[PDB]
Design a protein around this ligand. Structure first.
Ligand SMILES: NC(=O)OC[C@@H]1N=C(N)N2C[C@@H](OS(=O)(=O)O)C(O)(O)[C@@]23NC(N)=N[C@@H]13
Length: 822
């Protein structure tokens, strides 16, 4: 296996070549491929000439576009603010669950708020081992009859671990040994035990620039509890000059480079906001030209304007290249340009500032003051996104790149410094590189605010009208019905196309669409990504009053209620003893007949297979050999149609599960409507025949029973309605436009002869479900949106009332946190 790294300079190629020799990762060989600039490397990776390079966030954005089609895959983790530990969050979530779901696992946290390595489930007496994230180590469960397992100790904190490594297992004399606090985080002030120097670090141990102090001098105050580890764009100046930020016009400037976010996007955004630059849209020429009029002479590697390359010092064709062969390229090159007095101000980020407190440099704040180097958090041009290793979108080398860097970091190879110079291959300030979420792209990595801000400098971005709802459609018939809606809507409705509901959620997140109707099984993912219900489908045929007068009180929303249905004859069966019994399920994947029962059973029995929990059962979709297909009859006109997802199975579906109950089962998992639909001689067939409703009851979660009529107070869970989701800031617009459309084209629409929202000749259930009575505004309560939309019962039964389930690999990408401003 091979990884070919693209380098942009002779200096970087030298360092990459040293790593080929010095860094021995078994099974993966590194090789180095030289190109003369950042853009030529981007093209080499797109073309397969190389596999990976490290890019500034501004180039991550440029590389994501169709010319190159690259994506970020590895980056340094960062933190925005201190958070609850994972164990304490899990305890709070599970204590907030539905108390009628009895016997749930509540985690056990220790005096630092971490998981005890041994976790136990009170109601079942089972114990198991966990990792630092509280996830079960599979195959360590022990039953109550045995003593609790022996579980390895928890991994030490960053500080205690680096203290252990520094000590090397026998004092490390003459070397820095980190000093940790009681919680095992880094003390704010650190001192070198041999040189006498002291400096400040944040809570995860990163040095604060501008704080390094030789012995005998006064130390700057170190801030405690600093968990803001985003990097900051800053403007650095010498204390021998005296201009302020608003007098930059006509000065000389050094920039890390034309495409870098700290050397271009951040300062330029501020120039534009302050109107120091006469420029707003692409009608006034390019940004680069306007900047060319502002400064008298600059070094901005990668620029074309002549005065913006005037102060660079690269020899011959190397001059002004996005490459270390231009000595003023990058953060440290821009600082060198100030230091050598080719510029009056350098634009870079806090991680390239001097570590020493004392000296001739300080920061130029945009509020027209100057502040010391260590005050960049209050004197800056914005937080900037993380930088990242990128590769082709297809990801054919992602695993090899990840494996190599994880192994090289484990072995402590010299990835992050070099004799040959600074910031070669990676930023010298980097300490660890970790894999990003597998579905991350530039949009989710940079975040919507920085992504749009960098788009804004390249094109005028016409913002879509808040008076138009772009509806996302998932198949061609839906598209065609939405084109008919658009034609009658007077421009209120437009249409977009995607292949599946998850891709619609992506389009709405990225501003390509505005709304989509989602089944229940997608709402957890939509709500985690930050969309909100705007309106919901009301399905109750018996009461039209909430549809007639909007806003009025809904007596019964009318969704299905999952129940456990048993015969009045069998009077021993209660909820708490279904184990081993024979059960009938509509089919695997059905929410009321499977997801809700499987959910409650795993919550109360340590995630035991619902296949193993019951005795013999019928649940179409299971494997024909398993005990879940034994009751499954098949087709009476024998063909093999057994345990199949069709009507060719006698026991399939809502009626079929009810069949299996009366014929040969103790319990059936079904919506509450099925019993009334097949009793009181409502079904003609011979098995139904008579079968009085009062011959059955439903099981309550508290061990009691009730007649099949009290499903509102004695069910497993009610389902929430389907919802129309949108972005939070668009909810009020979408509600207004849809309610208006509904007064025209709903079931009592004033213009319902011109168009019907809730039916179509083109297909069934297009855009909305065909039995929808109307759409009702979602009344947002002051509570967690999970609990608000699902209801506490469903949230607990299906998701353990947790925000940590991952039913879709999009969730880790769309919840990735960003380094944005306000
Ligand atoms: N009447 C009725 O059912 O309205 C449904 C409507 N939409 C939902 N998805 N919900 C879930 C229900 O949760 S539940 O536990 O009460 O079922 C709810 O009623 O709270 C509700 N939450 C809010 N804010 N409005 C409600």
């Amino acid at each position: 296996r091979h990884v070919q790294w693209c380098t942009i300079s002779h200096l970087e190629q030298k360092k990459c070549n040293d790593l080929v020799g010095s860094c021995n990762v078994p099974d993966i060989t590194l090789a180095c491929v030289y190109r003369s600039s950042t853009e030529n490397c981007m093209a080499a990776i797109k073309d397969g000439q190389a596999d990976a390079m490290f890019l500034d966030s501004g180039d991550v954005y440029k590389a994501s576009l169709d010319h190159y089609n690259l994506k970020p895959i590895i980056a340094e983790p960062y933190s925005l603010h201190r958070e609850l530990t994972k164990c304490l969050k899990h305890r709070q979530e599970s204590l907030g669950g539905d108390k009628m779901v009895k016997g749930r696992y509540i985690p056990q946290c220790d005096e630092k708020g971490n998981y005890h390595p041994v976790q136990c489930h009170a109601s079942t007496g089972y114990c198991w081992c966990v990792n630092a994230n509280g996830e079960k180590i599979e195959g360590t469960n022990t039953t109550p009859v045995q003593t609790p397992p022996t579980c390895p100790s928890q991994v030490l904190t960053k500080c205690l671990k680096e203290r252990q490594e520094a000590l090397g297992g026998k004092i490390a004399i003459g070397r820095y040994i980190p000093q940790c606090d009681e919680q095992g985080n880094y003390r704010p002030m650190q001192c070198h035990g041999s040189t006498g120097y002291c400096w400040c670090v944040n809570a995860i141990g990163e040095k604060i620039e501008g704080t390094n102090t030789p012995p005998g001098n006064t130390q700057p105050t170190c801030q405690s509890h600093d968990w803001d580890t985003c990097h900051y764009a800053v403007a650095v100046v010498k204390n021998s000059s005296t201009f302020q930020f608003g007098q930059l016009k006509g000065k000389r400037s050094c920039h890390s480079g034309l495409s870098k976010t700290d050397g271009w996007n951040a300062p330029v955004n501020v120039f534009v906001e302050k109107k120091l630059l006469p420029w707003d849209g692409l009608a006034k020429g390019s940004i680069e030209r306007a900047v060319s009029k502002f400064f008298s002479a600059s070094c901005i590697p990668g620029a074309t304007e002549t005065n913006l390359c005037k102060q660079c010092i690269g020899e011959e064709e190397k001059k002004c290249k996005s490459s270390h062969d231009e000595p003023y390229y990058g953060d440290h090159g821009a600082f060198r340009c100030l230091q050598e007095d080719k510029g009056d101000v350098a634009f870079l980020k806090n991680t390239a500032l001097p570590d020493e407190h004392s000296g001739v440099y300080e920061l130029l704040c945009p509020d027209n003051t100057r502040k010391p180097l260590n005050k960049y958090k209050e004197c800056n041009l914005g937080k900037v996104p993380a930088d990242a290793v990128v590769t082709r979108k297809a990801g054919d080398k992602t695993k090899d790149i990840n494996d190599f860097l994880l192994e090289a970091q484990k072995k402590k190879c010299k990835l992050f410094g070099s004799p040959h110079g600074k910031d070669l291959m990676f930023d010298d300030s980097t300490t660890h590189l970790a894999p990003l979420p597998s579905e991350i792209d530039a949009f989710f990595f940079l975040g919507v605010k920085w992504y749009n801000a960098m788009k804004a400098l390249t094109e005028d971005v016409k913002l879509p009208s808040k008076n138009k709802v772009r509806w996302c459609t998932i198949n061609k018939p839906e598209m065609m019905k939405c084109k008919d809606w658009a034609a009658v809507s007077g421009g209120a409705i437009a249409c977009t196309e995607a292949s599946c509901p998850e891709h619609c959620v992506k389009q709405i997140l990225k501003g390509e669409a505005d709304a989509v109707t989602l089944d229940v099984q997608y709402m957890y993912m939509a709500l985690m990504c930050g969309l909100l219900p705007a309106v919901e489908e009301y399905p109750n045929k018996d009461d039209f009053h909430p549809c007639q007068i909007p806003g009025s009180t809904i007596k019964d929303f009318g969704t299905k209620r999952a129940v456990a249905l048993v015969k009045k004859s069998n009077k021993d069966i209660k909820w708490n003893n279904l184990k081993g019994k024979k059960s009938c399920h509509t089919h695997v994947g059905d929410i009321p007949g499977w997801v809700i029962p499987a959910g409650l059973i795993s919550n109360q029995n340590d995630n035991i297979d619902i296949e193993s929990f019951f005795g013999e059962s019928c649940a179409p979709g299971s494997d024909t050999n398993s005990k879940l297909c034994k009751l499954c009859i098949g087709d009476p006109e024998n063909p093999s149609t057994r345990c199949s997802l069709s009507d060719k199975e006698a026991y399939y579906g809502n009626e079929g599960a009810f069949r299996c109950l009366v014929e040969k089962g103790d319990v059936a998992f079904v919506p509450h409507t099925v019993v009334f639909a097949n009793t009181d001689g409502k079904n003609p067939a011979e098995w139904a025949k008579d079968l009085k409703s009062e011959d059955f009851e439903i099981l309550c979660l508290d061990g009691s029973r009730a007649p099949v009529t009290n499903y509102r107070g004695c069910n497993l869970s009610g389902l929430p309605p389907r919802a129309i989701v949108t972005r939070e800031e668009s909810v009020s617009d979408v509600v207004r436009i849809l309610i208006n459309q509904q007064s025209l084209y709903g079931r009592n629409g004033f213009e319902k002869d011109m168009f019907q929202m809730f039916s179509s000749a083109k297909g069934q259930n297009l855009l909305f479900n065909d039995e929808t009575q109307c759409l009702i505004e979602f009344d947002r309560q002051p509570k967690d949106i999970m609990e608000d939309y699902f209801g506490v019962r469903y949230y607990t039964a299906v998701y353990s009332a947790s925000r940590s389930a991952v039913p879709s690999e999009l969730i880790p990408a769309c919840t990735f946190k960003h380094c944005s401003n306000s």
